[PDB]
Amino acid sequence: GMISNEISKLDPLNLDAFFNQLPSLNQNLEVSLLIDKLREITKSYLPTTFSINDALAATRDLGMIMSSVRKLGIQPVSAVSDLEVFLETLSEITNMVPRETSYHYGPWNPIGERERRFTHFPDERGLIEGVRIAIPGIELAIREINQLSNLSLNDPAFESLAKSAALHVYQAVDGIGETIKKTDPYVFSHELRPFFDPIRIGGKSYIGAGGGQIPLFVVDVKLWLGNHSPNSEYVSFIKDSVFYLPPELRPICVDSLLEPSVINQKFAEFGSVEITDQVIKGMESLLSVIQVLLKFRKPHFQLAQRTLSKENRGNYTTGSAGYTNSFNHMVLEFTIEVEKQIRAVLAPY
Ligand code: HEM
Ligand SMILES: N[C@@H](Cc1c[nH]c2c(Cl)cccc12)C(=O)O
């Protein structure tokens, strides 16, 4: 478990003053100052001496300087070739990618004066608050949904855990609503999106931080996807994402991809045991969770559609992971289909 407060409060590379300048440096395209800071960092710090929390915060801070350079069109590790050993040492300690993710940008990013930010645009706050709210709640919902596999539908503990998970997933809904109300789609495409492009590090390419990196897909795999669609595009996105996750989430995701999902296994229990009143309540509680997922994916799809429109898309047709809104349409159709299947099983009652 990575406690966010213990990471957000760190400044292991003494960059707090620099991050008050960074929005202005990025505005004036001052690539010399960005590159000079990367060079100073590799000479000023023995990263092998860092604790885990220090290395996570360093990844957060160094990652944002790197993404700023990449935003100008320069591969930062090709320009500062000593970065590669530095980043490699850091990722040995974190056992995470040598690059920042949504985790670094949201929950590990401090609130207030020290908040790390690429730009001066307040639309940026919409992305930061979006993932900073979404991630902790989704993580609690993962712990709770994981316990459902080992409870009976007829146990009120089942229904109560699923309800808790639905409440915690609502944090993803609150997160995307913060984005819808603060982030203008046109300012996103033209001012924010360019900071989330891929960076070549040790001969492979790491996508930038993205909303898709909140572990919502982990909820999906345990809850409905399981091992049921082996060749889908969504299982390929998840495949590519497992090792971007914090280590503690990786076994949950891997085992869930290799097992039947909760809803599939609870469908079997339902149509084979004595269907009582607690059992309907328990099955009703799984549909509640799914319906919360839709309360996220429906407005998310609209937001992505206004942003990728001809008028609004700027220079991009994809998200940071290389997909169009078609991918969102497919994840959301998958979820609508589970809601239909659950409502079918319940219709007699
Ligand atoms: C202007 C704002 C946004 C746009 C244009 C946008 C668009 C997209 C796009 C194009 C994808 C496809 C995957 C990829 O290529 O990376 C995607 C995936 C995803 N994004 Fe966003 N997004 C926005 C804001 C957010 C926010 C704030 C969050 C979370 C708080 C979020 C969460 C997700 C998730 C969870 C996925 C994976 C698909 C799913 O589970 O439905 N997005 N988004
Ligand atoms: N969710 C979209 C747009 C996006 C890029 N970076 C983000 C961040 Cl860092 C937070 C929230 C959303 C986004 C994507 O995954 O590329």
Numbering used by the authors: 0 to 348
Paper excerpt:
Pyrrolnitrin, a potent antifungal compound originally discovered in Pseudomonas strains, is biosynthesized through a secondary metabolic pathway involving four key enzymes. Central to this process is PrnB, a heme enzyme that catalyzes the complex transformation of 7-Cl-L-tryptophan. While heme enzymes are known for their abilities to catalyze redox reactions, the reaction catalyzed by PrnB is unique and complex, involving C-N bond cleavage, C-N bond formation, C-H bond activation, and decarboxylation. Naismith et al., established that PrnB belongs to the indoleamine 2,3-dioxygenase (IDO) and tryptophan 2,3-dioxygenase (TDO) superfamily due to its high structural similarity.
In the previously reported complex structures of PrnB, the indole rings of 7-Cl-Trp and Trp bind to PrnB in distinct conformations, while the amino groups of both ligands directly coordinate with the heme. In all cases, the indole rings of the ligands are oriented perpendicularly to the heme, but the positioning of the amino acid groups varies. Consistent with our spectroscopic data, the binding conformations of 7-Cl-Trp and Trp are nearly identical, with the amino group directly coordinating to the iron center, while the carboxylate group is stabilized by interactions with Gly210, Gly211, Ser319, and a heme propionate group. There are two notable differences when comparing our FbPrnB structures to those of PfPrnB. First, a previously disordered loop in PfPrnB (residues 323–331) becomes ordered in FbPrnB structures (residues 312–323), where it plays a role in stabilizing the substrate carboxylate group through Ser319. This loop closes over the substrate-binding site in the presence of ligands, likely aiding the enzyme in positioning the substrate correctly for efficient catalysis. The difference is primarily attributed to the substitution of Val117 in PfPrnB with Tyr104 in FbPrnB, which reduces the size of the active site pocket and restricts the indole positioning in FbPrnB. In contrast, the binding poses of 7-Cl-Trp are similar between the two homologs, likely due to the 7-chlorine substitution, which locks the indole ring into a similar orientation in both structures. Due to the strong binding, the measured KD for 7-Cl-Trp may represent an upper-limit determination, and the actual value may be lower than what is reported.
